[PDB]
């Protein structure tokens, strides 16, 4: 009975908020490896070695 997500007006709930998050599910693959001392994305580019 959490049907507050199920509504015909608040379907645009998720359409004004996900254009923020176009990278925000992968910022751990951009930002945490700045301090992990791993090579997660350090093979992707010839930017860094």
């Amino acid at each position: 009975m959490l049907s507050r997500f199920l509504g015909p007006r608040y379907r645009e709930l998720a359409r004004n908020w996900i254009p923020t998050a176009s990278m925000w599910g992968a910022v751990g693959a951009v930002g945490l490896v700045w301090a992990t001392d791993w090579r997660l994305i350090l093979d992707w580019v010839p930017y860094i070695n």
Partner: protein
């Protein structure tokens, strides 16, 4: 039978022009009364610091006697037929108009032409209109709403002609001579800057021949006829605080810079202000009302009233809100109001926009009810757009507004912008300008 069919059967406006450039417009509506008047491009934004009380001084002497009808003889003629005379003055317009019977139209046009062309500015009516104006200024100081909107113009347009008041300072009122008033009429009461409008039981052919009989001796082009220079005015983010703890309630006005008259952004910005709304403590709606700021202020008893405004000039304007509350409630009212502006820049829903479009359609047709507001809409639309925009054209602009358009225009005008603030009364809890400026952007979006 349909609202769409009823907008087609509205009678149209007919416009003509004389040889001197005077425009003549009418709308015939088959009723025994009429309203006729003269609308002029004159106001306090055309005055400098030496004659800032000049146009408001001239409006006082307009019904005190002309060359043909001296003294009270003008007043006896209007009253003996059962007619009314009125006038006003804003920062950009000036109007004089008559409400009379529709068979008294030739006498009404003749009196209006004698008022604007041959008014006597006699030196004994001056020096006794000074004391009437000086006492009216002291009465204006007791109206807190009029003081706080004069403060908002003086800080948003600081070093421009648009920051002056209509009435002018008290030292100018004490020193305006007879020579300064005759220069004001010769420079500003000119025929391509005037509109003769009429609404009611009028034929357009009859008004045109009355305009040729009484107005044709107006000077068309002028001595040396230089183009009236238009200096624009810039907006400045700033604030002014007047602290007076002895007043019982506090008045606060805040605005950002808005669009001009002919900007097409004006229509979706009025759909947006209709979603915020207005409130007053004598309302019966209260806690059930659709506006979020109105429903919160009624539940918690936060304010006495609020309103949103859309003030337009030729190139700029003011877009904001005004509210009245007690000394313990200023910080909460500013928090909830700024949170509703940011919730329209993002997040604006389609169901809010449908309600806000219905409010704007009802407010447009409710204004045009009677001969006097129809005649005023004719006279100031020809000075502003150069034409009268009919009701069918307003409806097709309103119908193309949706939720994504409102989000784009509100983000352009509100988001991350410097406001202008004015405050009067017990305002110790009015927040700091750095905390107000930080309220115009979010953490997330």
């Amino acid at each position: 039978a349909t609202y769409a069919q009823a907008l087609q059967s509205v009678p149209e406006t007919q416009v003509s022009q004389l040889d001197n450039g005077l425009r003549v417009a009418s709308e015939q509506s088959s009723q025994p009364t009429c309203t006729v008047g003269v609308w002029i491009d004159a106001g306090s934004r055309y005055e400098n610091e030496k004659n800032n009380g000049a146009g408001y001084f001239v409006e006082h002497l307009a019904f005190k006697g002309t060359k043909n009808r001296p003294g009270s003889a003008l007043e006896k003629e209007v009253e003996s037929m059962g007619a009314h005379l009125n006038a006003y003055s804003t920062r950009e317009h000036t109007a004089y108009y008559i409400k009379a019977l529709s068979k008294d139209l030739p006498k009404a046009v003749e009196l209006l032409a004698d008022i604007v062309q041959n008014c006597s500015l006699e030196d004994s009516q001056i020096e006794k209109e000074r004391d009437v104006i000086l006492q009216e200024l002291q009465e204006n100081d007791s109206s807190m709403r009029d003081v706080v909107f004069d403060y908002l113009h003086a800080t948003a347009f600081q070093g421009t002609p648009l920051a002056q008041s209509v009435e002018g300072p008290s030292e100018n009122v004490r020193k305006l001579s007879r020579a300064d008033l005759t220069e004001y009429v010769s420079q500003h009461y000119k025929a391509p800057r005037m509109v003769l409008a009429a609404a009611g039981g009028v034929e357009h052919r009859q008004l045109l021949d009355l305009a040729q009989k009484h107005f044709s001796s107006l000077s068309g082009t002028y001595v040396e006829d230089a183009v009236p220079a238009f200096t624009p005015c810039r907006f400045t983010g700033s604030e002014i605080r007047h602290r007076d703890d002895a007043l019982p309630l506090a008045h606060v006005a805040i605005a950002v810079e808005g669009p001009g008259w002919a900007n097409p952004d004006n229509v979706p910005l009025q759909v947006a202000n209709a979603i915020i709304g207005h409130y007053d403590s004598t309302y019966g709606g209260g806690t059930h009302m659709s506006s979020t700021l109105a429903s919160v202020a009624a539940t918690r008893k936060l304010c006495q009233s609020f309103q949103t405004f859309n003030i337009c000039y030729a190139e700029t304007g003011l877009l904001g809100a005004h509210f009245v509350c007690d000394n313990m409630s200023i910080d909460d009212m500013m928090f909830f109001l700024q949170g509703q502006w940011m919730r329209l820049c993002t997040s604006a829903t389609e169901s809010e926009v449908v309600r806000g479009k219905n409010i704007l359609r009802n407010a447009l047709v409710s204004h045009l009810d009677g001969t006097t507001p129809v005649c005023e809409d004719i006279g100031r639309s020809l000075l502003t757009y150069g034409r009268r925009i009919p009701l069918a054209e307003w409806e097709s602009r309103i119908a193309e507004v949706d939720a994504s358009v409102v989000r784009e225009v509100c983000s352009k005008y509100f988001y991350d912008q410097c406001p202008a603030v004015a405050g009067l009364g017990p305002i110790e809890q009015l927040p700091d300008y750095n905390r107000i400026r930080s309220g115009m952007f979010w953490l997330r979006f």
